[model samples]
Target: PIEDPIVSNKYLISYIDEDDWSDRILQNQSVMNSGYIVNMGDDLECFIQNASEKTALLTKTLNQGVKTIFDKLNERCIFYQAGFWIYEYCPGIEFVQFHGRVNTKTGEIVNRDESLVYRLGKPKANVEEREFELLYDDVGYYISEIIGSGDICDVTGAERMVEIQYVCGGSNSGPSTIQWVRETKICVYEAQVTIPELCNLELLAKNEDQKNASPILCRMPAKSKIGSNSIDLITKYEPIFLGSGIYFLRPFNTDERDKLMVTDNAMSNWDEITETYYQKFGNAINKMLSLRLVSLPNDSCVWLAEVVDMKDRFQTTLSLNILNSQRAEIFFNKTFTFNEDNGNFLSYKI
Candidate 1:
């Protein structure tokens, strides 16, 4: 093993074999930490009174560290309507405008495929979107429940402004009929929409192995001789931590069991499926990892965590004003560095 290593990642995977027996294990050792180096567990499974009671005391707790600090930072730009100031209440017009022939009688869309003769009318204009909340002189309609976003412009004399429809408009409320009213529709501003893209940063220990992975074809095996089929598991995510822990697992023991899924091998076993497994495989793997390591709660709150960190993208810190019983102030901080010649880390075959 190298004394100093360049940190990386590994994903755990589930595998099955000749006997149909199954189990899961960490995939590799791309990275480790102050916690991993000093103390480690065996390849044995055991029952638990408390996984934490077994929580390795880091003789000295070290502060460590980001990247997509949010599940989707600015997850707004694409979903929300955007455009230059156009004098109207149509929300998505900023993205699309459609112009074609008329079914002007009841404002029906004609020319579906008659001769497919094409006509284009020019619009020196803006756009609209899914649902539009138009705030006119004194009233606004909550135009929501929509399909999508896009644009259409016809500069050929073959189209009527009234016959044009933005790619997205009215859901259960439309197939909308468009018309303008005097002062009746002076589009002032876009109905504002915003989300608090805020999240608390967590410095996790063991980073809990992820739950459920895709089974590999032919990645099969048989159980070890004896106490060899075991794992060290985690149940609930106590503060920001949840299901995942060292699994000293050795191949499948039984022949009829389903195989284990693969886990993300990044230094941190960050998983987006906390809730996914709990309702299903939580208990199965709970047993597989050892009762000594994991005991899950029936009503585990949705421990959804969203984050990403490692070279390409980084988020070393964050300040938060938590909204709750009391507005509290908190901070998330971290750092990044390469190991001595990147030797402290390693890749091995067992």
Candidate 2:
């Protein structure tokens, strides 16, 4: 039996994993039955069953074998299912004629006839219920038209407080492109029609002309404040709205020539500083000249003024008009936090 020991040992080892072997064998057998050849060439050309040939054979065999079985089942079930079958009983359009007559007192028969025609169209499909209230009074209609007119007018108004919060953390190892997402909430007061008066002198009028005349269009004009909040949710994590009063963060390592870089060198020099630096620095200096800085850390530390300038730029760029009577009273608290996991910059609201 051990004539060739190497070959015999190899054959014995093949059956060690019998479960896996059996599964593979069964899988290959199923594949073969489904019109596939197991030992195709290395490139593996596989054959698929011709759908037309398979279907014809299957249909002929099933028809010969199962026709009678189904026939008997149908015969037994037909009578019981007859009543469940539905029939279409729709009638076409119908036309009808009507006539009326009265007998005379003299015993002479008198008749009068009139022809009337009618036609019926198909019934409408059932529709789901809906909700709508009708407002009929002339005053209500006028007010509705006024309010439902074109787009709301853009009004100049100042926000009491502007709060901007930014979260920065991403795989930005190089010069990061930071953008501030501006969200504006504005409340503007404009003229609107007041509610109509309850008592009406025309309702007591006796003449039809007075009653039919258009309802008295007495409307009081008053200014009512309507609030509209527009939120520009940032998708690219960038700030585009840099107007006269917006809070934003500068990148930590951006080039000093560019405004977004926050390197120490960029902050140290004046002539070599970026446009953002000068813009921010100039704004801070102006604020300092006007004594706007409440408590700056030191003359050297002008980051607060820079942040204020950045926010102001964002607001101005976004057309955020200051409606407040006191422009100098506008204030915002800015804070920066470093993310160790990611080398991105973050600015927070205080």
Candidate 3:
């Protein structure tokens, strides 16, 4: 009778009033966390789950699971052996990517307890017809990925055309299934051509690109960034130049954006990226310098400057030049010895 406490509710206590314990240190701000005190053996093994989770929940899924994960992450505790948290979260990488696993039995979406996307699938049979709605939360990315499981796995013999249509802004692209043999039940969709902006995904998701993969984030633009060129541009440019990134060479970081040749194609961006090869490695095809040549006495030293004007960059310049040296000048019958140089070429300035 004692072991099978499930037989009655009498053995269960309704509550515990630890007011003294809570009152003394409740406001101490120390207990808002978890603790692990192991003065003896085996007590340290109770928290393996907190530190050794193989798969982690990504940020955007905060409302659903991040709450507990966040609390656990922030909830401090003194563990003589607390090394696993080191491996649980990487230094800067968000440990989040919980694919909503789906499971159903007796007509109820049982897996609904774990996630929404898994629960967000097409309404169950006889589950009643409700308004089809778009889904999303202000947590992470907007990219949505869907997969199926359970009897849904045996889709090959689904008596009828059990079509699973994924919808967004009236447009549809079913990343659904129809294959078999312990089917992955994984939904895979081709890249959508047209899309809408992710409403500042970077700003919202705290730099979590994975959040952009939320299915509810379906009504998104094909642009790489929150604001950028279109899918049309994606095909034409390399991602390096299409948006602000580490791909460009900076003679100076502040004016790094000075003048860059940009286009609407990736290859073109890549081409621009290629051009920087000199700004970095190879010799520059073009260079500007201020210098003087001293040819010594009695020589056809230096005395002339050449000037050429043009439009813009292959015409890229802003000055004149001096190349040949023929005792330099013939100005007013005296420039050949104009004293512009003390027995030498005139000094140049930037």
Candidate 4:
């Protein structure tokens, strides 16, 4: 019932008029987009299966079922905030402990004093894969992946290590969150990850034909046009610095292109206004490029330009900076579209 470009006539209500054909087409496209979503889901599932097979073959210790569960976290990193420090855990890899202050402008972690970062565990040298211990009892099967031979401990003089346990807990759709983390012994750390996979029940018996009968509805809501919506255009920009007399203007709305501009002293006012508005209304603002004086004998402080009519198109420029070498600057624009396959915005060539 789903196809890209919607070549099939199966979805049409034949009695409906041609005027409703466009709406039917839109519904088809939305359903195909849901197909695209499932493609992504399939890719994730394939990645996990491949990782499970590879690790299971290499280790020669874990069964396929257990390895499949462990491979769910093949290349995932989860951060847990505990007390003053944040725990960084990468399954089948390493554990880290660090803390940093959040930057106000970007909301990124900024650590001035680097001594607060500490490594809890990493794989031993010359080891192909780390050893793990699995326990089965009244509580069901649980795993303790050992990461040892790490940095020296000051008190015990022994190498530090950690035992991260994968236990049965949490909802099926929930993440493998940290239940607790602490130094259980000298130079030895312990942590518990509550994973839903560990709480799994046995699989249901296979149905011959009706197994694939489940279907997901793909009805997408229509998007509002910029003019139709009450969104302010000027409040959509975020000013980011690009050193050497330039600033990159990013729009909060992805439907628009980001702009580049030359530096100007008046840009600070734009920054203050935009930042305050963003903090208050959660939207950014435009930066510099100025209007120039068409010289009352050319000595005018007309520092920028706001008139450009080419092929019925209108444009404006506000001067951002004035250098010792007096060259009139305008808003220099650039644009880039993202790749659909991987959804990455390729680096723009300057």
Alpha-carbon TM-score of each model against the true structure: 0.18, 0.13, 0.18, 0.35
Q: Which has the greatest TM-score? A: 4
Query: Model 4's lDDT to the true fold?
Result: 0.44
User: Where is the poorest 10-residue window by lDDT in model 3?
Assistant: 306-315
Regions more than 4 Å wrong, model 2: 1-236, 244-350
| RMSD, one per candidate, in order | 24.6, 37.1, 28.6, 18.8
Residue 238 accuracy (lDDT) in model 4: 48
Best by lDDT: 4
Task: Return the candidate ranking by TM-score, descending.
Answer: 4, 1, 3, 2
Assess each prediction's global lDDT (C-alpha) against the native. Answer: 0.24, 0.25, 0.23, 0.44
Which lDDT tens digits does candidate 2 get at residues 31-124? 5475433323432222342219755643443333222222232322111111322111111111111233223254222332334321111211
Candidate 4 lDDT over residue span 269-302, tens digit each: 3423343322321111122222111112212232
The runs of at least 3 residues in candidate 4 whose Cα sits more than 4 Å from the true structure, single-residue gaps closed, are 1-62, 101-113, 124-128, 136-139, 201-350
Candidate 1: Cα lDDT at 155: 36
Question: 29-49, model 1: which lDDT tens digit per residue?
Answer: 332211122112542222111
Backbone atom clashes (below 3 Å) for every candidate = 56, 22, 24, 18
Q: Is candidate 2 or candidate 3 better by TM-score?
A: 3
